[PDB]
Amino acid sequence: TTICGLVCQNAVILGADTRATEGPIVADKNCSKLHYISKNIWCAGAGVAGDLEHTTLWLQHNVELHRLNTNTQPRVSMCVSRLTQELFKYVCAIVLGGVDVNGPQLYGIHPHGSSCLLPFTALGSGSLNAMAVLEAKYRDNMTIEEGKNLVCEAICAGIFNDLGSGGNVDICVITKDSYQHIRPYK
Amino acid sequence: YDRHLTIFSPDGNLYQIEYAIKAVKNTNITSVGVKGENCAVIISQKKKLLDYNNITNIYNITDEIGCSMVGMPGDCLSMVYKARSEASEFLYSNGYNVNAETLCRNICDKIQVYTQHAYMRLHACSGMIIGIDENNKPELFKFDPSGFCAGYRACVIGNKEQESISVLERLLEKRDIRNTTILAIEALQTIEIEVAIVSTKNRNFTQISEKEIDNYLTY
Amino acid sequence: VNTFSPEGRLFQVEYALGAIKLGSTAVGICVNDGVILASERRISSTLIEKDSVEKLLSIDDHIGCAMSGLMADARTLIDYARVECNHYKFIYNENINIKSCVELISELALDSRPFGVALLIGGVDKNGPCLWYTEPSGTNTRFSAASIGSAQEGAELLLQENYKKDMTFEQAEILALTVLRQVMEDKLSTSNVEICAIKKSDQTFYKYNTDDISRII
Amino acid sequence: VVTGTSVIAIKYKHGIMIAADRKASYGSYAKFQNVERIFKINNKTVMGFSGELADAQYLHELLTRKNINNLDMYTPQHYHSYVSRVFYVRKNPLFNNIIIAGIDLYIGFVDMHGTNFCDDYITTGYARYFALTLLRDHYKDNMTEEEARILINECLRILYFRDATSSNFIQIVKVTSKGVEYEEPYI
Amino acid sequence: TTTLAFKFKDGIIVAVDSRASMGSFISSQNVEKIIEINKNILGTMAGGAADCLYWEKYLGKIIKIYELRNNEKISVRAASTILSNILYQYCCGIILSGYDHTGFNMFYVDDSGKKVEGNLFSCGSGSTYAYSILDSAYDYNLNLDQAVELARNAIYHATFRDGGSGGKVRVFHIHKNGYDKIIEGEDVF
Amino acid sequence: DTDNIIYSPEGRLYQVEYASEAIKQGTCAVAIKSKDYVVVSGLKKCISKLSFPQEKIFKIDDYIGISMSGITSDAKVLTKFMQNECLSHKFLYNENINIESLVRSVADKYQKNTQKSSKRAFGVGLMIAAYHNEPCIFETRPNGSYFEYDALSFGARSHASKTYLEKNLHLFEECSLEELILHCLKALKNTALAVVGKNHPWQEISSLQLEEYLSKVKM
Amino acid sequence: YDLSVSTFSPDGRLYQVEYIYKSINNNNTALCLECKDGIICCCINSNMIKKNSYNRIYHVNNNIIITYSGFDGDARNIIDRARSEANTYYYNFHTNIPLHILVNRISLYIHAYTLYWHMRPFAASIIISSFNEKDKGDIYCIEPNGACYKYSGIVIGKNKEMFKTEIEKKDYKDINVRDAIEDIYKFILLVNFSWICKESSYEFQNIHEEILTPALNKA
Amino acid sequence: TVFSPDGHLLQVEHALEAVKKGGCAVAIKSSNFAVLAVEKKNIPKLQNPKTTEKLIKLDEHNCLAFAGLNADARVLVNKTRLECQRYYLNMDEPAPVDYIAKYVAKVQQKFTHRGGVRPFGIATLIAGFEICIYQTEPSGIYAAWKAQAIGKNAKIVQEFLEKNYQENMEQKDCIFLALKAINVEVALLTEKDLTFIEEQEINSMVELIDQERTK
Amino acid sequence: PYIDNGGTVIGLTGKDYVILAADTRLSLSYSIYTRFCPKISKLTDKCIIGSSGMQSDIKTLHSLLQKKIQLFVLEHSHYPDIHVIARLLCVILYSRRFFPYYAFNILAGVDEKGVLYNYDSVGSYCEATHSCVGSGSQLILPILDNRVEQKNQTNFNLGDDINFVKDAITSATERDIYTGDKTLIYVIDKMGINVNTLD
């Protein structure tokens, strides 16, 4: 599982792989590693699918419910505290991109629960293979179109280069005003 | 009997709640909390060998938040300690400081649970709450021993209440720190004192300086 | 419950006294050679299985305890007393000294509702038979000779009339049979009594066979 | 995992010496060359630890919080028995060989298991081999201060050279009728 | 150790080795393994000394309060079943022996809590050895003379053939009343 | 009204006050303090010609012993508690219990009973008499109050003993134990007496030697 | 209405709380004075039975001081609460407690019991104080049902209002360095004077009896 | 609850009355047999309306009858079932009527004693095995009996029963005395087996008692 | 959580007495702590007790049992029989079998002729004519076997017996490393309980 996301000139742009695997044989032609925690904040987890569907469910509802309970748009860092606190109680990395009162923030979250704000990120088997191409071409304040093409490039590289990663891609531009998803980037 | 306990009337109207409000309304420590344009003032009269230097109603419960309190004093120190507990748990859980109303969900709900549950007595204290919101608009709320997140552009509490609503209206027709604080200190004069603004540092909530008490009072 | 009276006596527990007066009588007499233990057996209805109901019981093998007042509360206190005064001997052979069995039962009896019963526990543990009345109030006391039930109101004097320490347990049997036959309406027979004994030697608890009491009378 | 290799204590009628070096090796190597392992629970009582550090400060705060309530005063004996009782409760644990000492005079040792006892001279940690026998060799009652401290100084002298982990300089305490004195000077 | 029990005509009987060694070393040969519970029933411990002693005394308690409760003697299968019900929570196997039925019943409760009823149980380390003699020399019910010689005999071969058990012999024929008692030293002749 | 969970308009609690209306029925007991010794006599009331009278005295520890005079059950419960506590003390610290730590503890138990509504106040008041070094006499009112004493008498017609206490210094003739005990038997006037101090700890001279000592008041 | 600690009166007063003021109004005086060079709490207990000792004042640390008035038991228990609090804070924070936070802690402690329908409020007002050169002397008096207040010296207990004429000479009361005592001994027209001053080394101390002599012999 | 100055308990004395006004039941006893017979009134149209009145079987070798509240009876009885099963588990042997009378008594008492619980409204009576019968009053007392009657007007049935009493008798004829004391809820404990007596079987006898009283 | 120490405490019932001797020396795996330790405690009355397990368990176990005898005697006003003492020990010890006390233990008392109870760590108690425990047991028991019992071949004069104890132990120091040269020796003749610091 590659998952790559990167900040542009006003919006985070996340992109991720779409192919589950049992370890030997593939067990799915497709999956959703771009869950929608809220209109202007999403998570892209990598790891065991089970744990991921779990904590993303519990997260989505903690955040949507808390948003119902208060005026403020659930600003991106609260999701990071909730998630990291949950993982800290105890195997699933995440990469979450949202836009808010601050900048288009993007975070990466380690399996032990560690958090970091990041300019651009990847996780999973493809991470290495994504750190290679991603870092080389990155520039702060890219035109969002540059995000549109790049993140697909680093994803495709982190696809072709791993046995454990493959299949069609999907990408989204989390503007603060709106998410703009597309089901198959490919 | 219905009066001896927190239960409904034959008329369907709760009693002991009204009595707790008499506790506040006979506490006789009036306090005017008016919002200012891009700021907000909260004032109270500070009322022997006793120390006026100690006395206050105003109290902060985070840097951004300060809540004047009136009523039975022990309940006040308790509701303040509860308030601080509340903001600390929210910050700890979520990494954001509470919006003033978010602190009023805790203040007003904790103050509420007393009302149904017959045992523990209804809350005997009330007061304003002020703080800069995530929205840049300053936020001034209130609460009642009966649950109320309220909501105001201006408020008064204590022995005086809606008596001074019409009095406040005259400032409301004229409602910067100069311009707003004078409305408050006058509103004490209109019907020493201790003044408290969030706009010192525009987000940090601090009681205004002692040396600068007089200059508004003499202007 | 424990609302102290202005008079200073505890209310509840002082209301609970009367329950023993409901009690049918029994006369325990510690003696130099044992403890005799008599009680009414004429309590019986004509059609209850004859003599199939004992007032006198046995907390342990060498303890026997006639009861006052409510039959139920007595059945409970005897239940827990059997349990505890057995549990005392869990690996070491000695059975609980009577004074301390009774001390248990009372120290529990102190603290629902106060028990309506009084007990007359007896047994041989120290070189010498013991006779302990437990008041419902939890006050615990060692008589040499004593009686329970409402008939104990005036029958007690009779003990004062006759009680010398120096008696063969048989002499004591005559004595307690005297005092208890006196308060009965029926001329005493084995259906009028349910006598038991704990010897200074045998130390064993033993309800008398009816043939025995029929023989002495 | 900080550790303090040794502590010793010795007594004579006019008072009771008790000393240790200030090193606090953090595994293979020294971290704190100036740690304070000797600690003063009472004007007539101190605890000296020689094992893992954290546990030692833990027991330090415990004995103190335990004291202020009683501050007749809590005897060194009661302090020692509370100490051992704590180790043995913990066991069923904390790593130290804390010794209690103070005042007539009282020295008591406690092994890690809550094993404990009382003697005229006690040594703790690496000292036991490299100081105790020597300090078992020349020890005598009613040593004057000069005799005694020159004796313990001969012992720490043997020790710093033989013990793998010691500091050159010794925090040192003597308990006297006047009150406990924690000498500042180190060597 | 080594424990034996069997029922001939006149009753159930109990036999045992008094040795109680902690490892190769012998802690004691004075040790008594036979224990009475209710006035008529009794059991023999085998295996660990402390746990077996504990459970026997515990059994004495539970049985005693029951016996006080109903004011009578409980059947042997009861006393078996209580240990079967408690031991299953966790020791050492045991044998029980008593009179409720016109014949004395015999039982054997495993440390596993397995319960078994039968005619000539034996346990302990040396059980196998006397346990041969119990059918080679007792296919069927016999006499008290025959029986005390029998148990003394089978214990003797469980004494010679096994180093883990020995010491004194201690046979206890049980009458319909209570029981008898016999103890011996070496009997090689 | 009618529960110790509320104060009277006077400002008094009645329930706890009723405890002394309990204790006055109890038989008098008296105590004397020689400089190195303490002597405590009781009075064992006899319910019948055949009753053997109960013993007021107990023996909580080596040098500690007590003399409760109120309802017996609470008294025994306090004894079992004080004994279990002294033994917990020694079991912890290989040391005899401080007497005053004990008094402070038992008195804490009284207050814990006389504050909580559901638990009734004790109808008994201990008169502890002991020392861990120098002789002492403590009294515990059926509440959290406890007082040290030089000489104390309490229960029934203890009034005679009280007025009599003024007639002798507690140690007007301390130096001899026989002087002491004769003051004890005068002050109070089978009946009990007990002795504790210096070398011999607690002791109960209820022997026939005491029976000999009885004539000494009239000898 | 007056029957509950919790139920409000029709006029919002809490009569059951209000009675604790009566209790304390009758109970023994316990002045605490403040010098401009220290603090001196004192007591005048008015309780042959021992007369030698019955200290009301007690500390939570060798520097902080407590004094009370009212039921002895409840206050002794609150002193236990304060010891455990100061020591808890010393276990957590490796320092001695500021007097202020301890005072608010006891405010909450005493306050809690008022809210519970079964629970009985404590009947004892509590002075708590400390003085250091840097930590200037302050005397917090705690009336039950909260509202602890800082003071320059408050008399509490039975006769406090008639002593306030003397304490109101607090200019003269602050004038003293170590002779405020000698003034008090005539002013008041068993006793427990103490020390928290520079000469005290700021640590609390019972005033020396041969220092007590100059006061009594002064007139 | 609480003692009145007399020392009598009220909730219990009140509690009895629900039995002192309830459907009558009786038991007649002998060696290996006993006749338990109650009476319950129901609407004629509804044959199924009280298959519940019928005498309960706590164990194959045990049997019960009761009078008072049914709603409380179902509770007590179930506790009895669970308990006979518990004893029969811990012993691997059936519960003697003695021990179960003791257990049930301990319960009814317990509720009278410990707080938080309303006292029972029922009076029980139990047959088991030789065979012997135990009646248990709401107070928590219990007693062996040779014959007894629970229910409304128990005294007429019972004291008239004394006028007719005779001990051991016939397996069938011992039934007749129950009727002579007492539609009908008949059951016969025998062979340590409770049995629901055939409806028609007694009909012959049902005739004679109807007419021996007439002729 | 267990360390081995050799308290070598031995009991020995005389014809009208009991004798309980023990080396005082304490020791770690191979180094002597105190030269002098109390391996024997006095139960409050006519009986005493010894052990040889790890010293924490020795001390805390003797503490506990002392607390129990003191509590029992104060609650019942009655000094316990020796049997209730040892039985109570089986109780306390088995109550913790899942995490056993390491202190193997010895009791010596009189019933009014030294009734005795030596036993294993979990309370498997036994009476005996004599007793030994600690690392010095296995060595001395044959010496005690023959001096008094003559199972394959007058034995309790106080002088002759204290002598047998003496020579048995003094020999025990020689062949064993854990046994210390000092010995306490108690003697519970019916009058009272003597102590001896013979070494």
Ligand SMILES: */C(=C\S(C)(=O)=O)[C@H](Cc1c[nH]c2ccccc12)NC(=O)[C@H](CC(C)C)NC(=O)[C@H](Cc1c[nH]c2ccccc12)NC(=O)CN1CCOCC1
């Ligand atoms: C990333 C692979 S990796 C090596 O880079 O970390 C993916 C992430 C993923 C896959 N699917 C989703 C959906 C939503 C979000 C994220 C998602 N994870 C994996 O490839 C897992 C490999 C683990 C060991 C790292 N694969 C699985 O967990 C298996 C999925 C599966 C099995 N059967 C199926 C049927 C239908 C759909 C999916 C599956 N299952 C397991 O490994 C079984 N585990 C065993 C232990 O944990 C719980 C179940």
